[PDB]
Amino acid sequence: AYSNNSIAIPTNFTISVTTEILPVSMTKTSVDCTMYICGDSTECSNLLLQYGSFCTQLNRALTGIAVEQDKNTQEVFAQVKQIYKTPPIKDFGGFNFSQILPDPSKPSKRSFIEDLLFNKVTAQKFNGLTVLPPLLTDEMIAQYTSALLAGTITSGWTFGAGAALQIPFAMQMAYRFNGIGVTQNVLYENQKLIANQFNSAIGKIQDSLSSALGKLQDVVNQNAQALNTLVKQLSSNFGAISSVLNDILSRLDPPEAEVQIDRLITGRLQSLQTYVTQQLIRAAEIRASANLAATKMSECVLGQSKRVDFCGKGYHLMSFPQSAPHGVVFLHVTYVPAQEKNFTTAPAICHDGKAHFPREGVFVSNGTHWFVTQRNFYEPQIITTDNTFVSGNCDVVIGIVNNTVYDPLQPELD
Amino acid sequence: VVNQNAQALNTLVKQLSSNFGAISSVLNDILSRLDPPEAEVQIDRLITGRLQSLQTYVTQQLIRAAEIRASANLAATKMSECVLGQSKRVDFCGKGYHLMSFPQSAPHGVVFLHVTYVPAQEKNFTTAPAICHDGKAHFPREGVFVSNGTHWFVTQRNFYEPQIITTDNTFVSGNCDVVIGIVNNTVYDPLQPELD
Amino acid sequence: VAVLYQGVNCNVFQTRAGCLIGAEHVNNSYECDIPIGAGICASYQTSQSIIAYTMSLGAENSVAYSNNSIAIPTNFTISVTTEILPVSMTKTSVDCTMYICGDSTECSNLLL
Ligand SMILES: *[C@@H]1O[C@H](CO)[C@@H](O[C@@H]2O[C@H](CO)[C@@H](O)[C@H](O)[C@H]2NC(C)=O)[C@H](O)[C@H]1NC(C)=O
Ligand SMILES: *[C@@H]1O[C@H](CO)[C@@H](O)[C@H](O)[C@H]1NC(C)=O
Ligand SMILES: *[C@@H]1O[C@H](CO)[C@@H](O)[C@H](O)[C@H]1NC(C)=O
Ligand SMILES: *[C@@H]1O[C@H](CO)[C@@H](O)[C@H](O)[C@H]1NC(C)=O
Ligand SMILES: *[C@@H]1O[C@H](CO)[C@@H](O)[C@H](O)[C@H]1NC(C)=O
Ligand SMILES: *[C@@H]1O[C@H](CO)[C@@H](O)[C@H](O)[C@H]1NC(C)=O
Numbered sequence: 001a002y003s004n005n006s007i008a009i010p011t012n013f014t015i016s017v018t019t020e021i022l023p024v025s026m027t028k029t030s031v032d033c034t035m036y037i038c039g040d041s042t043e044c045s046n047l048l049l050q051y052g053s054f055c056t057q058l059n060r061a062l063t064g065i066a067v068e069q070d071k072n073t074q075e076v077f078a079q080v081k082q083i084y085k086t087p088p089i090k091d092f093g094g095f096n097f098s099q100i101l102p103d104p105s106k107p108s109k110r111s112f113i114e115d116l117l118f119n120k121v122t123a124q125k126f127n128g129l130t131v132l133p134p135l136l137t138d139e140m141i142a143q144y145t146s147a148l149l150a151g152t153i154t155s156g157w158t159f160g161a162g163a164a165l166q167i168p169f170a171m172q173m174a175y176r177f178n179g180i181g182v183t184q185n186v187l188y189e190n191q192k193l194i195a196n197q198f199n200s201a202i203g204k205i206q207d208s209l210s211s212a213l214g215k216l217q218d219v220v221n222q223n224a225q226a227l228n229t230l231v232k233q234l235s236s237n238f239g240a241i242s243s244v245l246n247d248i249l250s251r252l253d254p255p256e257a258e259v260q261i262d263r264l265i266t267g268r269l270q271s272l273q274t275y276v277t278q279q280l281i282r283a284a285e286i287r288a289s290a291n292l293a294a295t296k297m298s299e300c301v302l303g304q305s306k307r308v309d310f311c312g313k314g315y316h317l318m319s320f321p322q323s324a325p326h327g328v329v330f331l332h333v334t335y336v337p338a339q340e341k342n343f344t345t346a347p348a349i350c351h352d353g354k355a356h357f358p359r360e361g362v363f364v365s366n367g368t369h370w371f372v373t374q375r376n377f378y379e380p381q382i383i384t385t386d387n388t389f390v391s392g393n394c395d396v397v398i399g400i401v402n403n404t405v406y407d408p409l410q411p412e413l414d
Numbered sequence: 415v416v417n418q419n420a421q422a423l424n425t426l427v428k429q430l431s432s433n434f435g436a437i438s439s440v441l442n443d444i445l446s447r448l449d450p451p452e453a454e455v456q457i458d459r460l461i462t463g464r465l466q467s468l469q470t471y472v473t474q475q476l477i478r479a480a481e482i483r484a485s486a487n488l489a490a491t492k493m494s495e496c497v498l499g500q501s502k503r504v505d506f507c508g509k510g511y512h513l514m515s516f517p518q519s520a521p522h523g524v525v526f527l528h529v530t531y532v533p534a535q536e537k538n539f540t541t542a543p544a545i546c547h548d549g550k551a552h553f554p555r556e557g558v559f560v561s562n563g564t565h566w567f568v569t570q571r572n573f574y575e576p577q578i579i580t581t582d583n584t585f586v587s588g589n590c591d592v593v594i595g596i597v598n599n600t601v602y603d604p605l606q607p608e609l610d
Numbered sequence: 611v612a613v614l615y616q617g618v619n620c621n622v623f624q625t626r627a628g629c630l631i632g633a634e635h636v637n638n639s640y641e642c643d644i645p646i647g648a649g650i651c652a653s654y655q656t657s658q659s660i661i662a663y664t665m666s667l668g669a670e671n672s673v674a675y676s677n678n679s680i681a682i683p684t685n686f687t688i689s690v691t692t693e694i695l696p697v698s699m700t701k702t703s704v705d706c707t708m709y710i711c712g713d714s715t716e717c718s719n720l721l722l
């Protein structure tokens with residue numbers, strides 16, 4: 001229902017925690033050029049000398065892809081070069097943080113949620129398909145995620161722009177409310193309710209991740225499928241008589257075998273060209289996912305964002321990053337007002353003959369009453385001379401009513 | 415970028431010298447060592463090999479152009495956000511707090527120069543979330559209450575500046591029983607001697 | 611030099627990257643300099659030689675957390691920083707006739 005004289009104001013609010021997943025890197029692979037076309041044959045190298053520039057381009061291109069996974073891993077999990085210790089005392093005002101911070105007695109340095117994500121996560125070398133291992137282990141990555149998680153719980157946002165500064169958590173959350181337009185007294189009046197809502201939403205997340213991940217197994221699926229695709233090409237002919245070079249060499253002198261060897265060479269070289277171009281496109285797609293995740297790391301975690309729907313859904317408060325195989329997991333802590341009530345409203349108020357405009361609030365009315373409240377939450381205040389400012393007369397305002405203003409200087413006259 | 419272009423050109427030039435299975439790479443030697451009806455297979459092998467080289471060169475240049483355009487759009491957004499006005503995004507106009515920025519030209523590119531605002535030294539202090547005067551709670555307007563341990567002040571959240579606590583720096587919104595951490599300390603009203 | 615192998619299981623130093631020949635393993639860890647893989651970073655320090663060590667994560671510092679104490683900056687600095695970005699690349703054009711065919715008529719006929 002839309003009207004020219006009405007407004008509805010939030011009265012309660014709820015907190016909720018939202019998950020989003022993004023891939024960060026992908027399996028590194030290096031494919032020899034000679035071995036794939038030629039096994040242990042000496043004559044198979046000689047016919048390949050004419051195309052030596054193709055082997056040098058194909059070996060250089062997978063190296064240039066190989067360094068990109070190292071830059072993608074090195075740009076998201078490293079916004080600080082200081083490892084912040086984790087305090088022993090665990091009282092943070094009633095906000096129970098026993099799930100995202102890692103328990104010391106655990107033998108691995110993951111916490112509980114990283115293990116749930118680790119359990120959800122799902123000879124080849126003879127043909128020359130080598131897999132190189134990533135530069136960083138999951139324990140050192142988990143050391144970086146533990147430093148980043150500790151820095152928001154200890155220093156707020158002023159540790160990634162400068163040297164760390166301590167601050168209790170009770171003022172950190174009130175600093176986050178004034179950034180979205182809410183007075184801080186709503187935090188100080190209802191801390192136990194939000195703390196138990198935050199603990200219940202963490203338990204809801206533990207139940208939701210345990211019941212999904214459709215964007216972190218596919219990137220492994222594409223590489224494993226494409227590798228089996230290059231495997232099956234070893235048994236194709238291309239209009240040849242056999243699929244094994246030593247069988248051609250064992251049965252027919254080399255001059256009477258060059259017509260089969262060149263026909264196998266062009267086909268296998270063409271399949272290498274296909275595999276290399278497919279890896280270049282997927283690597284560029286990963287580069288795009290990596291730069292976007294690095295911006296979310298430097299935007300949601302450090303500082304607070306003024307962009308609607310950049311971190312979660314709702315008015316963003318905090319984030320808590322986690323680490324899982326080949327990808328990051330963000331945990332946004334949004335704020336969503338709940339109950340509302342319809343009310344009569346007015347742009348301005350005339351009293352003395354001067355238009356009284358509200359400072360930071362909006363004028364509301366209950367019929368018998370006239371109050372002012374903050375835009376994003378209900379709290380009724382009487383009209384005073386410290387809550388409005390005067391400007392001009394009352395004839396230029398289309399919608400104005402009459403109501404008396406109490407001067408707080410009346411007892412000052414007594 | 416200059417290195418990548420000079421390699422991509424040099425490989426095109428080097429591929430001219432390979433026969434790709436032929437008995438010579440010089441077209442005039444093909445036309446002199448066979449009749450064209452029998453030299454068409456050597457010419458077609460050179461045609462297929464040079465077309466494969468040109469195909470790979472073109473695909474490589476299409477690939478590089480898309481990344482260069484992505485970097486140009488990123489520099490455009492830094493041009494309209496770092497140079498003009500301030501941003502409130504941290505780690506997107508250089509380390510720490512950013513004030514203004516200064517574009518400088520460079521061959522195939524641009525160099526930005528930020529002016530960063532970084533705190534340095536600090537001092538330890540005993541805080542309080544809120545202060546109970548006479549039944550009412552006094553929350554600071556935008557400050558945070560600090561105290562050396564013998565005097566209580568209020569200041570901004572990023573720079574030291576002691577100021578005497580006053581009724582014009584706090585607003586009341588209830589009582590003291592709903593707030594844990596509140597201390598007992600009186601508040602000065604500067605208007606009382608003005609009434610005398 | 612120090613020759614490193616990838617899949618070869620053998621100053622021999624055996625790692626998860628392969629077999630490492632010609633580097634003296636030490637227990638003193640440093641900031642990474644030359645990355646090899648699996649957490650191994652080599653350097654040329656003390657006599658000085660090609661040494662092998664497990665990388666050192668960031669730098670340690672103590673954190674101080676209280677339930678009633680705050681820290682307020684009292685001095686500030688001004689500095690400048692640089693960021694380099696490429697905006698364009700060299701424009702090139704290649705003719706489909708001259709590259710494929712030098713001087714010849716049937717080489718143009720075959721390309722119809
Ligand atoms: C705003 O919503 C919260 C959460 O529902 C309310 O908190 C509950 O209040 C009732 C009061 O009887 C308690 O029994 C519950 O335990 C509280 N929390 C839960 C888990 O629901 C709060 O009272 C609501 N406030 C308003 C203004 O209605
Ligand atoms: C936090 O929750 C866990 C799991 O229920 C519990 O074992 C722990 O004691 C709780 N800690 C606090 C501070 O209540
Ligand atoms: C708004 O509240 C008034 C006062 O109770 C009531 O008369 C009216 O029906 C309400 N309007 C809506 C939108 O329900
Ligand atoms: C608001 O709408 C009502 C019903 O159409 C109308 O009578 C009244 O004049 C309107 N007031 C303004 C300020 O437009
Ligand atoms: C406010 O009071 C003036 C003077 O009596 C009157 O002319 C005007 O119509 C009133 N407006 C209302 C009813 O809000
Ligand atoms: C800090 O914690 C200690 C131990 O629980 C407690 O005695 C003290 O009152 C707390 N101080 C504040 C202001 O929270």
Ligand SMILES: *[C@@H]1O[C@H](CO)[C@@H](O)[C@H](O)[C@H]1NC(C)=O
Nearest residue numbers: 546547549595596597598599
């Ligand atoms: C503060 O003063 C009130 C009233 O005298 C008293 O009841 C309360 O215990 C005092 N609290 C402290 C912290 O001294």
Ligand SMILES: *[C@@H]1O[C@H](CO)[C@@H](O)[C@H](O)[C@H]1NC(C)=O
Nearest residue numbers: 617618619620624625626628
């Ligand atoms: C290397 O070989 C030795 C002897 O067979 C064996 O004990 C060891 O486990 C092997 N290590 C690896 C990395 O395979």
Ligand SMILES: *[C@@H]1O[C@H](CO)[C@@H](O)[C@H](O)[C@H]1NC(C)=O
Nearest residue numbers: 533534535684685686687688
């Ligand atoms: C810190 O600030 C004071 C007062 O402005 C000044 O005297 C002192 O030289 C400054 N120190 C530094 C680190 O520049």
